[PDB]
Design a protein around this ligand. Structure first.
Ligand SMILES: CC(C)=CCC/C(C)=C(\F)COP(=O)(O)OP(=O)(O)O
Ligand SMILES: CC(C)=CCC/C(C)=C(\F)COP(=O)(O)OP(=O)(O)O
Ligand SMILES: [Mg+2]
Ligand SMILES: [Mg+2]
Ligand SMILES: [Mg+2]
Ligand SMILES: [Mg+2]
Lengths: 311, 311
């Protein structure tokens, strides 16, 4: 249950057990009764989402994020035909438009497997609740994610080890980013689209996702040593390119995380000063909350993750 | 110089020769002196862009679209590592954010090849001219395009022939769409982001891109018979799945185009009535103009394209 030594992070309060438990039961019923996601603890994802969205006004708001997070996972369920699989699944998020003949056939494919059932349903709820701007913004962040996956899968098909910055670029896209960027939707307000689009806000979001995603590299490092092949993460890539020992490579990855997290904070503090509108200040706080909550989930989840003996 | 018989389209005026010629010279200088795009007629792309953007206030506005269209092409210059290549090129469009150590190395990669030089420069000009909303919107349409490419490349690696609707879904993404959706930027006004994001506007745009992209399937069909392997387009896919003769499959593809184009028009007429704001009405007209101009460019370009003897 201990943090990575030297990892810069913020502790968080225990997540409201009443909420965790309610999310768990509703998420189990959705998975089983609505989308037949299998022929998985609700508790894991409930602690995750309650911890990451402390400002959600209701469990209904929390369930917007929870179903999308679970659907994200159903999709990870060779890489050779990945680009075709992911494109079709993307249509459950950004709909196909076609003729009266071909539309119904696409429509049937949305029931065809767990990942597409999961997405069609989870997105369905999101689109009813969110503004059209918040929906479009999510589709863009999902198109990023799928691109990230496809870079990673392309490298895996040849065992290619990218340069460190190249791995970092992939991991900018193959990245938690679609989760914190729905903080406004889940918080019951809107960050206006013209403000989301500012270059400074875009930089704040990218840094945040980049830091909180390297958190996962650091906590899941030991588990990934057993993944098929040579599964890439920042320590592994640093070690291989910068020809360092595993230990020093990992410690450097911790320092990289720290600089990304510190830069995220400085960038958010600056935007808060430059543009102190309420929906901006709340969004910035919710992104930091999602980030702190994501570190806490990784830290406490000793079922999935464990630490290397480098200290 | 003849249209596909039975293809529903709108004729267009001859493109202003003064403008075509000016675009050609400036685009040749950009390619040669700014981005070293080779160690290509300016005239082809000039007729293309003047024809597609009759409302551009200046050649500077036209050159925003022209450099992006040319950069798009430099990128098409096995599919196995495609997802890694395209991700890195995407960073020239949607920037990498990283540490003081890794940022400069990424920064150097932007000069490394023609495609990334082309994008970094072309996007550079776009970002200075457009609103932050118009920039974000372009990055999303480019992330769509790259996903489309990667589906197509994944299928090509196994010679997979998708179902027709599946091919159509890919071709929704691997699609001209980033070109007409910058019509406002090129026209010197803005479609507001909240209005762009409406589901009805999203459907109008998708149909338009879907029709004008099947135009390219129909005009480039004969050329593609010679592409390495079995290059997919709508007639080829219809023939193979619906086991039809090449001719009848092509004629059906013409009917599919016609229904997409008619549906695009009905959908735009409806939105124009539901929401008759000026920036909406102008954007709708500019999308139709881009679509009509794209058909005319395909029709007149007998250097790249020619027709099957099916009539
Ligand atoms: C948008 C969502 C929900 C997830 C984004 C994808 C990411 C970053 C992960 F799944 C975590 O990395 P990884 O794939 O290495 O996961 P594990 O280490 O836990 O297996
Ligand atoms: C955004 C831009 C500029 C282009 C989108 C990609 C598309 C649809 C094409 F290049 C045309 O199809 P295709 O690849 O079959 O081109 P050709 O038939 O002319 O070789
Ligand atoms: Mg993964
Ligand atoms: Mg991991
Ligand atoms: Mg192509
Ligand atoms: Mg073609």
């Amino acid at each position: 249950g201990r943090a990575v030594p030297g990892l810069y992070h913020h502790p968080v309060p225990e997540p409201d057990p009443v909420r965790v438990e309610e999310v768990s039961r509703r998420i189990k019923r959705w998975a089983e009764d609505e989308v037949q996601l299998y022929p998985f603890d609700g508790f894991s994802v409930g602690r995750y989402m309650v911890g990451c969205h402390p400002d959600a006004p209701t469990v209904d708001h929390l369930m917007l994020a929870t179903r999308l997070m679970v659907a994200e996972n159903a999709v990870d369920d060779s890489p050779v035909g990945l680009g075709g699989r992911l494109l079709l699944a993307h249509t459950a998020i950004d709909h196909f438009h076609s003729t009266a003949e071909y539309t119904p056939t696409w429509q049937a494919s949305l029931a065809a497997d767990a990942p597409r059932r999961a997405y069609d349903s989870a997105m369905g709820y999101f689109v009813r609740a969110a503004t059209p701007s918040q929906s479009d913004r999510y589709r863009h962040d999902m198109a990023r994610l799928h691109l990230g996956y496809l870079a990673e899968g392309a490298w895996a098909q040849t065992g290619h080890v990218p340069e460190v910055w190249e791995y970092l670029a992939m991991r900018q896209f193959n990245n938690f980013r679609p989760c914190p960027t729905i903080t406004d939707t889940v918080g019951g307000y809107e960050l206006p689209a013209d403000l989301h689009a500012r270059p400074d806000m875009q930089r704040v979001i990218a840094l945040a996702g980049n830091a909180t995603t390297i958190v996962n590299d650091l906590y899941s490092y030991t588990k990934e040593l057993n993944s098929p092949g040579r599964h890439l993460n920042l320590p592994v890539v640093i070690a291989e390119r910068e020809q360092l020992c595993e230990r020093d490579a990992y410690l450097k990855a911790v320092e990289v995380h720290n600089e990304l997290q510190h830069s995220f904070e400085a960038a958010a503090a600056d935007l808060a000063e430059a543009c102190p509108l309420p929906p901006v200040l709340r969004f910035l706080r919710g992104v930091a909350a999602w980030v702190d909550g994501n570190h806490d989930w990784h830290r406490t989840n000793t079922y999935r993750y464990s630490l290397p003996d480098f200290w």
